[PDB]
Amino acid sequence: LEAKKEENLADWYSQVITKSEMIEYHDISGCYILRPWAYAIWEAIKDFFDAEIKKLGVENCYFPMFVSQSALEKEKTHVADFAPEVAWVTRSGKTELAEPIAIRPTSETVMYPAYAKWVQSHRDLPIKLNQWCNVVRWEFKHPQPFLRTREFLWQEGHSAFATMEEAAEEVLQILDLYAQVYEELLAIPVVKGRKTEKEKFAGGDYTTTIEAFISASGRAIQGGTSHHLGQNFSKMFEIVFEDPKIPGEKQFAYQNSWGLTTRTIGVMTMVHGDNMGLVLPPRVACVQVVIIPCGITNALSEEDKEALIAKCNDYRRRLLSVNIRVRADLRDNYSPGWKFNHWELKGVPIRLEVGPRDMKSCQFVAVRRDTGEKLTVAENEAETKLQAILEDIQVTLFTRASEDLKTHMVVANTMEDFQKILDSGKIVQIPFCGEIDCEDWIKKTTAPSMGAKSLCIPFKPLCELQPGAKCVCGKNPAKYYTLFGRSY
Amino acid sequence: GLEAKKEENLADWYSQVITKSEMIEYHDISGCYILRPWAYAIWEAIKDFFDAEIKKLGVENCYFPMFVSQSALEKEKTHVADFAPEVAWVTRSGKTELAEPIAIRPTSETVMYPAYAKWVQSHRDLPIKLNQWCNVVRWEFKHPQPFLRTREFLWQEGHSAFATMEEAAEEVLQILDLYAQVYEELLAIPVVKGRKTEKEKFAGGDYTTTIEAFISASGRAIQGGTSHHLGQNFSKMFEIVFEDPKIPGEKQFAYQNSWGLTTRTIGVMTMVHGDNMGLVLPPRVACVQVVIIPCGISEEDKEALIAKCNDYRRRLLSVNIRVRADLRDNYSPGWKFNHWELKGVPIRLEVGPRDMKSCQFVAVRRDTGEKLTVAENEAETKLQAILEDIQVTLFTRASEDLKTHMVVANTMEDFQKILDSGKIVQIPFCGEIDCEDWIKKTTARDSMGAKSLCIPFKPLCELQPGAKCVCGKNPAKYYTLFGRSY
Ligand SMILES: COc1cncc(-c2cc(F)cc(CNC(=O)c3cc(N4CC[C@@](C#N)(C5CC5)C4=O)cc(C)n3)c2)c1
Ligand SMILES: COc1cncc(-c2cc(F)cc(CNC(=O)c3cc(N4CC[C@@](C#N)(C5CC5)C4=O)cc(C)n3)c2)c1
Ligand code: PRO
Ligand code: PRO
Ligand SMILES: [Ca+2]
Ligand SMILES: [Ca+2]
Ligand SMILES: [Ca+2]
Ligand SMILES: [Ca+2]
Ligand SMILES: [Ca+2]
Ligand SMILES: [Ca+2]
Ligand SMILES: [Cl-]
Ligand SMILES: [Cl-]
Ligand SMILES: [Cl-]
Ligand SMILES: [Cl-]
Ligand SMILES: [Zn+2]
Ligand SMILES: [Zn+2]
């Protein structure tokens, strides 16, 4: 690793994600290879989220990757938003197809004709379905690995309810699960909010979101999203059922959709990584502990070296007995300093050093990757202390990022205050009228050199909006404190 | 209740059963089908078994892009020539024509191997063992059939690269018996391990191994899983080369395998075990292993009954038996019987008021319909017993069929007779592509011709020395399994 994270964030990021062997570049731009080191993180997130939504009654399934032209168009706001980046398959071989078919940018228009077929009565609701699949949004803007890509992996959940209340309840349950993914799995603090009218999902009624802050770049990013679509899709696809209390009254299903993508890993990189490379939260780390033999003096007896390799394997089995994911790196090819650096780059939480003296002093050394602190631990305590230390790394990482967010998110009540705070690389909760025209005016007059976008309306703002407060536009009364910033 | 009869109209029976069991929904684009939860759970059961197994072998999961460049797509010529007609091309985003068309993967050799070339520099960088669960597209214009032959399907594809040929060779057989376990221990389907002929092998591979299942209802056989030794065919083309100090200055080409298994599995399960009442789920893969159904339906009597049902539910979740209590009051018991029979749940546990008061219940096996009265005591015992017995039963009934329908013939006269019987045939075979073409042509001439299925590792007989191929002109190389196929 050669570029410094605070000097050039993009070069740093690219260096870190490739040299940790998370990402390989592919010869089609905006498409990247998820190598096992990153895919294992996606799999940990999947293990957690899948079990949680199972408890909520959601079931997994798989819908086709192709959308017909007429299905894609039924909900005009939604297709108006997505149409410019829909990839169209037009031949197979040199044989033109009968009709162009589109690759799913999002599966509402794939799934909801099916929903309409399956909802025949109030007993068929609710329908709670989820799929883990890939989608394509073929924008021409510059792509960025993990954060903004042309193909990405994700989950998308789609549910249909008889009543608005059960649907509004699910929206928030899911959004809290996303917050749990970011905060408990990835040790990333997030702000829960609602999108403004301009930023909400096209076709939906309201969008709830979690926002993360990346202090290196001073910019925020959406980490997850949970929409209430209301009846805007069920009216276009005729997902209908007869009202049970009133005969012949056809009702339209109330719908939500919600998605979470591999953006998660990029945020985890941008937030925790440092100038030695990746830093993996223990809860998602592929390897949690790497055992590395040191000493190896060359005047060591064959008896001594064989006994040290033995002791390393004793540690390995020890840690496996208590469910710690542990790799012993007993390769004679590379030097110990080499391996130290190699596993630091990948961000293994703990490096476990065993050397001939500590080996017979009944102890070993643990090195935390987050703080760099070396600890000497007696053999006896290993699995206990190591687990206590993995816990402490998780906490420590979360805490640091929280201190970042608390320091870098502040209130401002006028446009001048706002502009200067924003220009110090912070995000700002300002009083806002909610109007698209004023949001555009903000983005215009506030131009790391782009105008601020609205990021969300927090469920729990920093200040209480005082009666009669006017927006930053000055022309209209303010409706809510809203988090604004520069954005990925 | 099911309408069509398997032995009368197999295609209609199949469509009826896959839709009414709520496995498949149709899509407005022909050739693509919706896997609903009931089918997807079977896929996920296969997924869990196979994932654990290949992990013990040192394969890791990953995810490669869906799109291939023209340059990459053509670098190995035999492979590209075989797949090009069925490759779907993206040509525009929105109303914007792309400068270069790009292709959707029909298989991911040409996505993955340019990366393999960058990762390999020394023998220490080997082996590379990567697997991906993903979707592929093969846009063929023949008529699709759900699960069996679709234009989009889910699969796993494993790709391995090794410094030496012996390691590669070992892995091909390891993966192939994993596939055989998936079929024989999970879906209760017997299969034939063998080698593809030169006409049927993976284009640009060295050799292809395969497992074939037999579908007695149609009389046809189907490939179920595939494991290819690619040799150095692709690494020479994508320059996956390494230096090893044992052989100074020689750039050495990696030895490579690829291996794949698809949702076709589920369809073969359906074709093999389904009956005229609908799907029949093997206990090992069944989403729901036992469905508890309250029968009958005062109130203290009603409430007591939903409660004893929930009692059985908690007791069965205790012992990791996958169980549903269908306590919906908006559907009658008969409706529920029919519904879960259509979905093939292995065991129906009926609780009526009389037997609730008599500390007993009734278990009904889906595969034989046989009803058994059971004490409340043995619910965790006898049920676990019965499920196990159902699994073996499905397997043994399947095997009988295979062993009755797979026979030897050593002359074309016999071969044709037995083939028209609805059976599959092992014949002495020269191995040549022309002979195989001719077997197909004349077996249709004298409603489709027979194709080579595999060359069995363990044939039914051994070839007499000096014996001739069933064509007469060339010495037979091996016994080869022929038959009509999907
Ligand atoms: C908006 O101006 C841009 C600026 N700079 C670059 C681009 C751009 C460039 C490209 F080459 C390709 C693309 C297309 N991909 C994406 O837009 C995208 C969106 C998301 N999203 C959107 C919000 C969400 C959350 N939570 C949704 C739940 C899903 C989530 O994860 C995730 C990923 C990996 N990719 C965009 C666009
Ligand atoms: C043979 O002439 C035909 C006759 N009648 C119809 C078609 C046809 C019609 C379509 F509309 C679409 C297609 C394309 N899909 C497939 O070719 C295909 C192959 C496999 N395969 C191939 C062997 C394999 C195994 N084991 C390999 C591991 C992969 C395995 O599962 C599985 C599935 C679900 N689909 C074919 C073709
Ligand atoms: O694209 C989105 O944001 C929604 C959430 C998952 C499905 N579509
Ligand atoms: O397409 C096939 O059949 C082989 C096996 C999976 C990858 N390629
Ligand atoms: Ca630069
Ligand atoms: Ca758009
Ligand atoms: Ca000591
Ligand atoms: Ca072909
Ligand atoms: Ca050869
Ligand atoms: Ca040379
Ligand atoms: Cl077409
Ligand atoms: Cl909140
Ligand atoms: Cl058929
Ligand atoms: Cl129920
Ligand atoms: Zn305003
Ligand atoms: Zn011959």
GROMACS .gro file of N, CA, C and O in nm, chain A residues 352-422:
model
  284
  352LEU      N    1  -0.198  -1.350   1.590
  352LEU     CA    2  -0.150  -1.428   1.704
  352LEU      C    3  -0.007  -1.474   1.674
  352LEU      O    4   0.015  -1.562   1.590
  353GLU      N    5   0.089  -1.413   1.743
  353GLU     CA    6   0.231  -1.442   1.725
  353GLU      C    7   0.277  -1.544   1.828
  353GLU      O    8   0.255  -1.526   1.949
  354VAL      N    9   0.340  -1.651   1.781
  354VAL     CA   10   0.400  -1.754   1.866
  354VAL      C   11   0.546  -1.767   1.827
  354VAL      O   12   0.578  -1.799   1.712
  355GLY      N   13   0.635  -1.743   1.923
  355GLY     CA   14   0.776  -1.756   1.900
  355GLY      C   15   0.844  -1.840   2.006
  355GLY      O   16   0.793  -1.855   2.118
  356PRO      N   17   0.961  -1.895   1.973
  356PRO     CA   18   1.023  -2.000   2.057
  356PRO      C   19   1.035  -1.966   2.205
  356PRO      O   20   1.028  -2.058   2.287
  357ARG      N   21   1.051  -1.839   2.241
  357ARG     CA   22   1.065  -1.801   2.382
  357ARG      C   23   0.929  -1.795   2.453
  357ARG      O   24   0.914  -1.842   2.566
  358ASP      N   25   0.832  -1.730   2.392
  358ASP     CA   26   0.700  -1.720   2.446
  358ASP      C   27   0.642  -1.855   2.449
  358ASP      O   28   0.583  -1.891   2.540
  359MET      N   29   0.677  -1.939   2.356
  359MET     CA   30   0.626  -2.074   2.349
  359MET      C   31   0.662  -2.154   2.471
  359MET      O   32   0.591  -2.243   2.505
  360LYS      N   33   0.779  -2.134   2.528
  360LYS     CA   34   0.812  -2.203   2.647
  360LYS      C   35   0.805  -2.118   2.770
  360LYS      O   36   0.836  -2.159   2.877
  361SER      N   37   0.756  -1.998   2.754
  361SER     CA   38   0.722  -1.916   2.868
  361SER      C   39   0.571  -1.924   2.893
  361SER      O   40   0.518  -1.844   2.963
  362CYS      N   41   0.505  -2.016   2.825
  362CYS     CA   42   0.366  -2.043   2.829
  362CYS      C   43   0.282  -1.923   2.796
  362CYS      O   44   0.191  -1.893   2.864
  363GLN      N   45   0.312  -1.857   2.687
  363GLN     CA   46   0.236  -1.738   2.652
  363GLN      C   47   0.247  -1.714   2.502
  363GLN      O   48   0.326  -1.777   2.433
  364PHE      N   49   0.167  -1.620   2.454
  364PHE     CA   50   0.170  -1.576   2.315
  364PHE      C   51   0.143  -1.426   2.309
  364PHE      O   52   0.113  -1.361   2.410
  365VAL      N   53   0.151  -1.369   2.189
  365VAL     CA   54   0.122  -1.228   2.169
  365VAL      C   55   0.001  -1.215   2.078
  365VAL      O   56  -0.010  -1.286   1.977
  366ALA      N   57  -0.092  -1.128   2.115
  366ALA     CA   58  -0.206  -1.091   2.032
  366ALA      C   59  -0.188  -0.946   1.989
  366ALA      O   60  -0.153  -0.861   2.071
  367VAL      N   61  -0.211  -0.918   1.861
  367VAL     CA   62  -0.199  -0.783   1.809
  367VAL      C   63  -0.331  -0.745   1.745
  367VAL      O   64  -0.372  -0.807   1.646
  368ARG      N   65  -0.397  -0.645   1.804
  368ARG     CA   66  -0.521  -0.591   1.749
  368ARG      C   67  -0.490  -0.506   1.627
  368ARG      O   68  -0.401  -0.421   1.630
  369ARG      N   69  -0.566  -0.528   1.519
  369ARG     CA   70  -0.544  -0.456   1.395
  369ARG      C   71  -0.597  -0.312   1.399
  369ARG      O   72  -0.541  -0.223   1.333
  370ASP      N   73  -0.702  -0.287   1.477
  370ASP     CA   74  -0.758  -0.153   1.486
  370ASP      C   75  -0.664  -0.054   1.557
  370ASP      O   76  -0.639   0.056   1.507
  371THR      N   77  -0.611  -0.090   1.674
  371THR     CA   78  -0.526   0.004   1.748
  371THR      C   79  -0.377  -0.025   1.732
  371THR      O   80  -0.295   0.063   1.762
  372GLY      N   81  -0.340  -0.143   1.684
  372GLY     CA   82  -0.203  -0.182   1.672
  372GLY      C   83  -0.140  -0.230   1.801
  372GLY      O   84  -0.022  -0.268   1.799
  373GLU      N   85  -0.214  -0.230   1.912
  373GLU     CA   86  -0.158  -0.263   2.043
  373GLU      C   87  -0.121  -0.410   2.052
  373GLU      O   88  -0.200  -0.499   2.018
  374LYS      N   89   0.001  -0.436   2.098
  374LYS     CA   90   0.046  -0.571   2.126
  374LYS      C   91   0.015  -0.607   2.270
  374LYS      O   92   0.036  -0.528   2.362
  375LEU      N   93  -0.036  -0.728   2.290
  375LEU     CA   94  -0.073  -0.779   2.420
  375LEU      C   95  -0.004  -0.913   2.440
  375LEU      O   96   0.005  -0.993   2.346
  376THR      N   97   0.046  -0.938   2.560
  376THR     CA   98   0.103  -1.067   2.594
  376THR      C   99   0.002  -1.140   2.682
  376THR      O  100  -0.042  -1.087   2.784
  377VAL      N  101  -0.036  -1.261   2.640
  377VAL     CA  102  -0.141  -1.338   2.706
  377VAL      C  103  -0.086  -1.476   2.739
  377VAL      O  104  -0.015  -1.536   2.658
  378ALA      N  105  -0.121  -1.527   2.857
  378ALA     CA  106  -0.080  -1.662   2.893
  378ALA      C  107  -0.161  -1.763   2.814
  378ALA      O  108  -0.279  -1.740   2.784
  379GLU      N  109  -0.096  -1.874   2.777
  379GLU     CA  110  -0.162  -1.980   2.702
  379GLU      C  111  -0.298  -2.015   2.761
  379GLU      O  112  -0.399  -2.022   2.690
  380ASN      N  113  -0.302  -2.030   2.894
  380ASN     CA  114  -0.423  -2.073   2.965
  380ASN      C  115  -0.548  -1.994   2.923
  380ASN      O  116  -0.654  -2.052   2.896
  381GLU      N  117  -0.536  -1.861   2.914
  381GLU     CA  118  -0.652  -1.775   2.889
  381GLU      C  119  -0.695  -1.765   2.742
  381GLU      O  120  -0.796  -1.698   2.714
  382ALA      N  121  -0.624  -1.830   2.648
  382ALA     CA  122  -0.635  -1.793   2.507
  382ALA      C  123  -0.778  -1.766   2.459
  382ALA      O  124  -0.816  -1.650   2.438
  383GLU      N  125  -0.860  -1.871   2.447
  383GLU     CA  126  -0.991  -1.856   2.385
  383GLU      C  127  -1.077  -1.754   2.458
  383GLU      O  128  -1.158  -1.684   2.396
  384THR      N  129  -1.064  -1.745   2.591
  384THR     CA  130  -1.138  -1.642   2.664
  384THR      C  131  -1.091  -1.504   2.621
  384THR      O  132  -1.169  -1.423   2.567
  385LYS      N  133  -0.961  -1.477   2.639
  385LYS     CA  134  -0.909  -1.343   2.618
  385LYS      C  135  -0.927  -1.302   2.473
  385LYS      O  136  -0.978  -1.192   2.444
  386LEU      N  137  -0.896  -1.392   2.379
  386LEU     CA  138  -0.914  -1.359   2.239
  386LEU      C  139  -1.059  -1.322   2.209
  386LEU      O  140  -1.086  -1.226   2.137
  387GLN      N  141  -1.155  -1.394   2.268
  387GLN     CA  142  -1.294  -1.357   2.242
  387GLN      C  143  -1.325  -1.222   2.305
  387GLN      O  144  -1.384  -1.134   2.240
  388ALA      N  145  -1.278  -1.200   2.429
  388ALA     CA  146  -1.291  -1.069   2.491
  388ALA      C  147  -1.228  -0.962   2.404
  388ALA      O  148  -1.275  -0.848   2.402
  389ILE      N  149  -1.123  -0.997   2.330
  389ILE     CA  150  -1.059  -0.893   2.252
  389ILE      C  151  -1.136  -0.869   2.124
  389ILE      O  152  -1.152  -0.754   2.082
  390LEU      N  153  -1.193  -0.975   2.064
  390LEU     CA  154  -1.269  -0.955   1.941
  390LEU      C  155  -1.389  -0.865   1.966
  390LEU      O  156  -1.413  -0.766   1.894
  391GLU      N  157  -1.463  -0.893   2.074
  391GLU     CA  158  -1.566  -0.802   2.124
  391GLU      C  159  -1.513  -0.659   2.134
  391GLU      O  160  -1.573  -0.565   2.081
  392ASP      N  161  -1.397  -0.641   2.197
  392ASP     CA  162  -1.350  -0.504   2.217
  392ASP      C  163  -1.317  -0.436   2.085
  392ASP      O  164  -1.333  -0.314   2.074
  393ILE      N  165  -1.273  -0.511   1.984
  393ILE     CA  166  -1.245  -0.445   1.856
  393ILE      C  167  -1.375  -0.397   1.794
  393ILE      O  168  -1.386  -0.281   1.751
  394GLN      N  169  -1.480  -0.480   1.798
  394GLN     CA  170  -1.609  -0.439   1.743
  394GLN      C  171  -1.653  -0.307   1.808
  394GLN      O  172  -1.663  -0.204   1.740
  395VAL      N  173  -1.674  -0.310   1.940
  395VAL     CA  174  -1.704  -0.190   2.017
  395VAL      C  175  -1.614  -0.075   1.977
  395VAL      O  176  -1.661   0.033   1.939
  396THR      N  177  -1.482  -0.097   1.981
  396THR     CA  178  -1.391   0.015   1.957
  396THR      C  179  -1.420   0.077   1.822
  396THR      O  180  -1.439   0.199   1.813
  397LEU      N  181  -1.436  -0.006   1.718
  397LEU     CA  182  -1.460   0.048   1.585
  397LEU      C  183  -1.589   0.128   1.583
  397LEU      O  184  -1.590   0.245   1.540
  398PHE      N  185  -1.697   0.070   1.636
  398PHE     CA  186  -1.823   0.143   1.640
  398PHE      C  187  -1.804   0.276   1.710
  398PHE      O  188  -1.839   0.382   1.655
  399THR      N  189  -1.737   0.274   1.826
  399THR     CA  190  -1.723   0.395   1.905
  399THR      C  191  -1.652   0.502   1.825
  399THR      O  192  -1.701   0.616   1.815
  400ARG      N  193  -1.542   0.467   1.759
  400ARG     CA  194  -1.468   0.568   1.685
  400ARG      C  195  -1.556   0.630   1.578
  400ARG      O  196  -1.565   0.753   1.566
  401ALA      N  197  -1.630   0.546   1.504
  401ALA     CA  198  -1.709   0.601   1.395
  401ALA      C  199  -1.819   0.687   1.451
  401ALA      O  200  -1.849   0.794   1.394
  402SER      N  201  -1.872   0.650   1.569
  402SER     CA  202  -1.973   0.733   1.634
  402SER      C  203  -1.916   0.869   1.670
  402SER      O  204  -1.978   0.972   1.643
  403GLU      N  205  -1.796   0.871   1.724
  403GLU     CA  206  -1.737   1.000   1.757
  403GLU      C  207  -1.719   1.084   1.632
  403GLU      O  208  -1.740   1.206   1.635
  404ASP      N  209  -1.689   1.019   1.519
  404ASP     CA  210  -1.682   1.091   1.392
  404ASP      C  211  -1.816   1.153   1.359
  404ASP      O  212  -1.827   1.274   1.336
  405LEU      N  213  -1.922   1.072   1.361
  405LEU     CA  214  -2.053   1.121   1.321
  405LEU      C  215  -2.099   1.233   1.413
  405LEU      O  216  -2.141   1.340   1.367
  406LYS      N  217  -2.088   1.212   1.545
  406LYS     CA  218  -2.126   1.316   1.640
  406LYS      C  219  -2.049   1.444   1.615
  406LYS      O  220  -2.106   1.554   1.628
  407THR      N  221  -1.923   1.435   1.575
  407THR     CA  222  -1.849   1.559   1.557
  407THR      C  223  -1.885   1.625   1.425
  407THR      O  224  -1.883   1.748   1.415
  408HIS      N  225  -1.922   1.547   1.324
  408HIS     CA  226  -1.932   1.597   1.189
  408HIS      C  227  -2.075   1.620   1.142
  408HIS      O  228  -2.095   1.652   1.024
  409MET      N  229  -2.174   1.603   1.229
  409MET     CA  230  -2.313   1.632   1.198
  409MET      C  231  -2.363   1.737   1.297
  409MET      O  232  -2.366   1.713   1.419
  410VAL      N  233  -2.400   1.854   1.246
  410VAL     CA  234  -2.433   1.968   1.331
  410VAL      C  235  -2.553   2.042   1.275
  410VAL      O  236  -2.591   2.026   1.159
  411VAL      N  237  -2.615   2.124   1.362
  411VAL     CA  238  -2.729   2.208   1.328
  411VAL      C  239  -2.681   2.343   1.276
  411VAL      O  240  -2.582   2.399   1.326
  412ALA      N  241  -2.752   2.396   1.177
  412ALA     CA  242  -2.731   2.531   1.126
  412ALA      C  243  -2.867   2.585   1.086
  412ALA      O  244  -2.947   2.513   1.026
  413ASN      N  245  -2.893   2.712   1.118
  413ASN     CA  246  -3.025   2.770   1.097
  413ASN      C  247  -3.029   2.877   0.988
  413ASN      O  248  -3.137   2.930   0.959
  414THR      N  249  -2.915   2.911   0.927
  414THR     CA  250  -2.915   3.007   0.817
  414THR      C  251  -2.822   2.959   0.708
  414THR      O  252  -2.734   2.875   0.729
  415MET      N  253  -2.839   3.018   0.589
  415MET     CA  254  -2.765   2.973   0.471
  415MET      C  255  -2.616   3.001   0.482
  415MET      O  256  -2.535   2.926   0.427
  416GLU      N  257  -2.577   3.107   0.553
  416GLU     CA  258  -2.436   3.139   0.567
  416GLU      C  259  -2.366   3.038   0.658
  416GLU      O  260  -2.265   2.976   0.621
  417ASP      N  261  -2.419   3.023   0.781
  417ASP     CA  262  -2.377   2.916   0.872
  417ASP      C  263  -2.365   2.784   0.797
  417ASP      O  264  -2.260   2.718   0.801
  418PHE      N  265  -2.475   2.746   0.731
  418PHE     CA  266  -2.483   2.623   0.653
  418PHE      C  267  -2.367   2.611   0.555
  418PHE      O  268  -2.298   2.509   0.551
  419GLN      N  269  -2.345   2.715   0.474
  419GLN     CA  270  -2.245   2.703   0.369
  419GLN      C  271  -2.107   2.680   0.428
  419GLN      O  272  -2.033   2.592   0.382
  420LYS      N  273  -2.072   2.753   0.534
  420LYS     CA  274  -1.935   2.741   0.585
  420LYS      C  275  -1.914   2.607   0.656
  420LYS      O  276  -1.807   2.544   0.643
  421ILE      N  277  -2.014   2.563   0.733
  421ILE     CA  278  -2.004   2.432   0.797
  421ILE      C  279  -1.989   2.324   0.691
  421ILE      O  280  -1.903   2.236   0.700
  422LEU      N  281  -2.076   2.328   0.590
  422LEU     CA  282  -2.065   2.234   0.481
  422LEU      C  283  -1.925   2.236   0.420
  422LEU      O  284  -1.868   2.131   0.389
   0.00000   0.00000   0.00000
